[PDB]
């Protein structure tokens, strides 16, 4: 390696001797891609009587010299293609002068015509070929793929095509959203107070205002109160940062989506779902059924329903159900399973979180968990016939929450009331409880038309669709320790 | 107003008493737009019979009573659509112990059949009307549109408008790079160390990894990564943060568009800038003619080209072009004009802050300024000809900046010397000076094929499309003093 360094730098040493080192006036016209799509099915007869003379350019990343003759192979944003690289095609003192003294991992441009290899590999014999970027360092534990992504996407094939897909899931999501008549917004990535969920943010400091200023943890909020101002229809696809640990299986900044529609409940966010996640496998995988690490998921079926009690008593069931009417009962069978119950807490949120530590993770297969007790969910509708729950509903696969939606609150009077409750929960210990935003309230009560609104953890969405296991093998730079 | 409120929040009271003031079970099956595009051409002869009976709902905006029939105006998404109330053909009592006792502002859902009134006005005759959303606040100070947008959108159809062409404008260009092989990315918000641009970062601390980082001032070191790695070519439409206090058409957060082509220098930039332009005004718009302020701009017609030089000595004629080419004289020729000159600028940043005085306000037409010294373009590849210029230009229209692209360096030693130019630069005063970034610089020892890249502000460019003249104008949250 140090020798390998120290020759690549002496190689560059003589090119900057002899003019231009880094020129930038080659052209190609054609990815290998391209060129395989169109000619791969060709006889080498029908490929001879066409000389169609391309020009690509790429990394060098193998090389087989034979003394006047040389296969090397070139890869681009497509893929490989083979060049036949002879000295007796190119110009005087390229092959020798020039060809044989570069490196692997250096970028070159080539012309030729192609041609088939007696073997059925598509190939371009060379005519022109030149040097444009000198590699200084030789083409490339786990961690390495993170802190040096670009040396990943060199090696890996697997690696690339996550990060396609990736490009292609997103690119269909919009134009899934927009085909029903969503409109794509950009809602503030600081605020003044944060809100939308519950977690410790980010703060920083604005100095020509004086003004401590959060990062986003959701742009809830915000894109309600353009529901209230006539856009019944409105989507966001961008990132929200929350101060946790980087968990291996977490980012601090992390993609979300959320939509509104007006005039709709909670059920039509599920149908809404159900239609994603099948017609996003169906059109990026090609199948409805997806296989993901030990499990298959098939989203061209209904998922599972479950209110939450159902889900407690299902798996554990020697529960007695009566203990989760009663404070001092759930409290006391909260402890049994070893949840440590805070002070602020009260029967709704010790009833959820048994449901966390019993339930949670056993839901593999795509499952709604619908019913959640009012006091965790601050900004949804009160369900009619029991105003203790609320019409919200989370959804889960892999064991792991992928959306959260519901019919909104649009009630004024009770937003208030319940961010008054996040207050006092916050004075009493509870730091991921919400603020109180003034302004909210009183958008409200200009009138919200009754609402149901969804998010949904895309990155988790994408790990799914690629068989990744962690967060950060589907985020080009995740967060790591320098 | 006082009275408004105690009145209306004492109605919300009654319709509590008596069950749901909050209903959220009504269905709508047509948005006025629809209902315009289908039945604004039908005479009420050939409506009468085809008795279509939709429903819709929204805000009511406007109510005329005149005993045992009213006109009322509903706006939702798509526009306005009006409403004939009449007693006999709603439901017994509730023209005059419901309809009647709502206020202007309140969501009210309906359903009926369509005809046109007497003047070609398409209404609805209802045979069912309901409130679903009681406003406690009546229906609606430049600062106002800012800090309650949801006002100004119910009140403006500019405002709404301006907010449509924009989600329209970004589609489309997603479209246009889509088409163009390009690949759309996602790159850290949060940055250990920012660059890509000169500016004033903000800080924040992530607790769990003790590390104080920074808020993404440019997305471009990172986005050159992925051309290394392979992702030829790739772009990204997403915010950037900076702490230029701002006011005027200055956020502390907005909407830039990056892309990086392999293989091109900013000759094909300037090409790709001014099809985008041509394209976005011919579809979004449907001209290459854009009324701006005062002024019209033909994108159908290339742009003006003009050397940095050209542009000083075509603005101020009587300036003596030698003391550019010299640092005491240049240095004297900046105090003149009023120019405080820095202890660490040089002769390449003086001539460029003379250009900013006397040059830049008065390019009004698009304009491409090109051959920026080196001492302001620590990233850009110096010109062939003379080392003392780089490949870079930037892009003019209505006296404001829209864009900066050049063919990117990708000589490591060359971007190494110049990460210290601007270190020793920080160290003399310069707080805009970039980081040393010593990954950047390893990438690049792997080798980036030559590249062009290009950014482009796109706020800026919604105002030019919106005839919009504060960048605060063309985004929907502003940021405003408390
Ligand atoms: N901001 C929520 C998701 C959207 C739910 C709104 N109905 C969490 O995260
Ligand atoms: N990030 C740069 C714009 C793109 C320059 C790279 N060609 C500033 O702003």
Same mark, same amino acid.
């Given at each position: 390696?140090?020798?390998?360094?120290?020759?690549?730098?002496?190689?560059?040493?003589? $090119?900057?001797?002899?003019?231009?080192?880094?020129?930038?006036?080659?052209?190609?016209?054609?990815?290998?891609?391209?060129?395989?799509?169109?000619?791969?099915?060709?006889?080498?007869?029908?490929?001879?009587? $066409?000389?169609?003379?391309?020009?690509?350019?790429?990394?060098?990343?193998?090389?087989?010299?034979?003394?006047?003759?040389?296969?090397?192979? @070139?890869?681009?944003?497509?893929?490989?293609?083979?060049?036949?690289?002879?000295?007796?095609?190119?110009?005087?003192?390229?092959?020798?002068?020039?060809?044989?003294?570069?490196?692997?991992?250096?970028?070159?441009?080539?012309?030729?015509?192609?041609?088939?290899?007696?073997?059925?590999?598509?190939?371009?014999?060379?005519?022109?070929?030149? $040097?444009?970027?000198?590699?200084?360092?030789?083409?490339?534990? *786990?961690?390495?793929?993170?802190?040096?992504?670009?040396?990943?996407?060199?090696?890996?094939? =697997?690696?690339?095509?996550?990060?396609?897909?990736?490009?292609?899931?997103?690119?269909?999501?919009?134009?899934?959203?927009?085909?029903?008549?969503?409109?794509?917004?950009?809602?503030?990535?600081? *605020?003044?107070?944060?809100?939308?969920?519950?977690?410790?943010?980010?703060?920083?400091?604005?100095?020509?205002?004086?003004?401590?200023?959060?990062?986003?943890?959701?742009?809830?909020?915000?894109?309600?109160?353009?529901?209230?101002?006539?856009?019944?229809?409105?989507?966001?696809?961008?990132?929200?940062?929350?101060?946790?640990?980087?968990?291996?299986?977490?980012?601090?900044?992390?993609?979300?989506?959320?939509?509104?529609?007006?005039?709709?409940?909670?059920?039509?966010?599920?149908?809404?779902?159900?239609?994603?996640?099948?017609?996003?496998? *169906?059109?990026?995988?090609?199948?409805?059924?997806?296989?993901?690490?030990?499990?298959?998921?098939?989203?061209?079926?209904?998922?599972?329903?479950?209110?939450?009690?159902?889900?407690?008593? =299902?798996?554990?069931?020697?529960?007695?159900?009566?203990?989760?009417?009663?404070?001092?009962?759930?409290?006391?069978?909260?402890?049994?399973?070893?949840?440590?119950?805070?002070?602020?807490?009260?029967?709704?949120?010790?009833?959820?979180?048994?449901?966390?530590?019993?339930?949670?993770?056993?839901?593999?297969?795509?499952?709604?968990?619908?019913?959640?007790?009012?006091?965790?969910?601050?900004?949804?509708?009160?369900?009619?016939?029991?105003?203790?729950?609320?019409?919200?509903?989370?959804?889960?696969?892999?064991?792991?929450?992928?959306?959260?939606?519901?019919?909104?609150?649009?009630?004024?009077?009770?937003?208030?009331?319940?961010?008054?409750? *996040?207050?006092?929960?916050?004075?009493?210990?509870?730091?991921?409880?919400?603020?109180?935003?003034?302004?909210?309230?009183?958008?409200?009560?200009?009138?919200?038309?009754?609402?149901?609104?969804?998010?949904?953890?895309?990155?988790?969405?994408?790990?799914?669709?690629?068989?990744?296991?962690?967060?950060?093998?589907?985020? @080009?730079?995740?967060?790591?320790?320098?």
């Amino acid at each position: 390696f140090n020798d390998e360094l120290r020759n690549r730098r002496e190689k560059l040493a003589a $090119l900057r001797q002899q003019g231009v080192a880094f020129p930038n006036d080659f052209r190609r016209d054609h990815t290998s891609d391209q060129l395989h799509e169109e000619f791969d099915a060709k006889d080498n007869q029908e490929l001879e009587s $066409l000389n169609i003379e391309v020009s690509v350019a790429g990394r060098m990343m193998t090389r087989r010299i034979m003394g006047k003759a040389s296969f090397v192979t @070139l890869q681009d944003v497509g893929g490989r293609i083979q060049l036949y690289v002879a000295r007796d095609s190119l110009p005087e003192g390229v092959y020798n002068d020039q060809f044989k003294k570069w490196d692997l991992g250096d970028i070159i441009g080539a012309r030729g015509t192609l041609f088939k290899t007696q073997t059925g590999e598509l190939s371009i014999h060379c005519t022109e070929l030149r $040097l444009l970027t000198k590699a200084l360092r030789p083409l490339p534990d *786990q961690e390495v793929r993170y802190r040096q992504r670009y040396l990943d996407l060199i090696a890996n094939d =697997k690696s690339r095509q996550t990060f396609v897909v990736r490009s292609k899931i997103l690119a269909a999501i919009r134009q899934f959203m927009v085909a029903r008549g969503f409109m794509e917004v950009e809602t503030p990535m600081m *605020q003044v107070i944060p809100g939308g969920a519950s977690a410790r943010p980010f703060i920083t400091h604005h100095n020509a205002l004086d003004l401590d200023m959060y990062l986003r943890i959701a742009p809830e909020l915000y894109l309600k109160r353009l529901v209230v101002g006539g856009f019944e229809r409105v989507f966001e696809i961008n990132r929200n940062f929350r101060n946790e640990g980087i968990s291996v299986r977490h980012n601090p900044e992390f993609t979300m989506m959320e939509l509104y529609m007006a005039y709709a409940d909670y059920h039509d966010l599920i149908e809404l779902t159900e239609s994603l996640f099948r017609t996003l496998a *169906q059109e990026v995988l090609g199948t409805t059924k997806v296989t993901y690490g030990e499990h298959v998921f098939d989203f061209g079926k209904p998922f599972e329903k479950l209110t939450m009690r159902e889900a407690i008593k =299902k798996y554990r069931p020697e529960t007695d159900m009566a203990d989760l009417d009663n404070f001092d009962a759930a409290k006391a069978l909260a402890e049994s399973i070893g949840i440590t119950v805070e002070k602020s807490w009260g029967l709704g949120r010790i009833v959820t979180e048994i449901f966390d530590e019993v339930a949670e993770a056993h839901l593999i297969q795509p499952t709604f968990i619908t019913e959640y007790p009012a006091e965790v969910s601050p900004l949804a509708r009160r369900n009619d016939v029991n105003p203790e729950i609320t019409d919200r509903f989370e959804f889960f696969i892999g064991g792991r929450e992928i959306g959260n939606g519901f019919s909104e609150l649009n009630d004024a009077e009770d937003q208030a009331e319940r961010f008054q409750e *996040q207050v006092n929960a916050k004075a009493a210990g509870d730091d991921e409880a919400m603020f109180y935003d003034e302004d909210y309230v009183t958008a409200l009560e200009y009138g919200l038309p009754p609402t149901a609104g969804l998010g949904i953890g895309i990155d988790r969405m994408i790990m799914l669709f690629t068989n990744s296991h962690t967060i950060r093998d589907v985020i @080009l730079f995740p967060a790591m320790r320098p």
